[PDB]
RNA sequence: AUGCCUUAAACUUAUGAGUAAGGAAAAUAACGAUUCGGGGUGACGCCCGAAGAAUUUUUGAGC
């Protein structure tokens, strides 16, 4: 398996996929807007009640939503 | 972070069937009908019912 690679570890590949999705989506979120918690979750720092969201995919989908946009323009 | 060849590949980016139970967002429905009685609740929530002409000035007691 050294000379030509054999097989693939689909669980670790899925871990890598989660990292690459995270890096991609994170580069479009400015550093003030998102606060990363101790366990790897994310809070929205715009919205006054700080909702906490499990992934960066959910944080991006939240930042699309109308509650966030209304809370955004006040800040 | 170097140019070219058939975007170099006429290669693939897979992840079964169910049981029971939670968390978070998106989306979406409403705002003031006042008091009284009853249901409910630790308490509110909530729910069910009922209802500008009259003594100090400008619409005259004046003739
Ligand atoms: Zn937000």
From Swiss-Prot:
It is linked to Orofaciodigital syndrome 19: A form of orofaciodigital syndrome, a group of heterogeneous disorders characterized by malformations of the oral cavity, face and digits, and associated phenotypic abnormalities that lead to the delineation of various subtypes. OFD19 is an autosomal recessive form characterized by tongue nodules, dental and digital anomalies, narrow high-arched or cleft palate, and retrognathia. Some patients have notching of the upper or lower lip. This is Sodium channel modifier 1. Signal peptide: none annotated. A zinc finger (Matrin-type) spans 42-74. It comes from Homo sapiens. It is found in: Nucleus, Nucleoplasm; Nucleus speckle. As a component of the minor spliceosome, involved in the splicing of U12-type introns in pre-mRNAs. Plays a role in the regulation of primary cilia length and Hedgehog signaling. The modification Phosphoserine is found at residue 2. A motif (Bipartite nuclear localization signal) lies at residues 4-20. Component of the minor spliceosome, which splices U12-type introns. Within this complex, interacts with RNF113A, as well as with SF3B1/SF3b155, SF3B2/SF3b145, SF3B3/SF3b130 and CDC5L. May interact with LUC7L2 and SNRNP70. There is a cross-link at residue 67 (Glycyl lysine isopeptide (Lys-Gly) (interchain with G-Cter in SUMO2)).
């Amino acid at each position: 398996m050294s000379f030509k690679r054999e097989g693939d570890d689909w669980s670790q590949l899925n871990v890598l996929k989660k990292r690459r999705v995270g890096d991609l989506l994170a580069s479009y979120i400015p550093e003030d807007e998102a606060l990363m918690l101790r366990d790897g979750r994310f809070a929205c720092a715009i919205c006054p009640h700080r909702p906490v969201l499990d992934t960066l995919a959910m944080l991006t989908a939240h930042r699309a939503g109308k509650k966030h946009l209304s809370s955004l323009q006040l800040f």
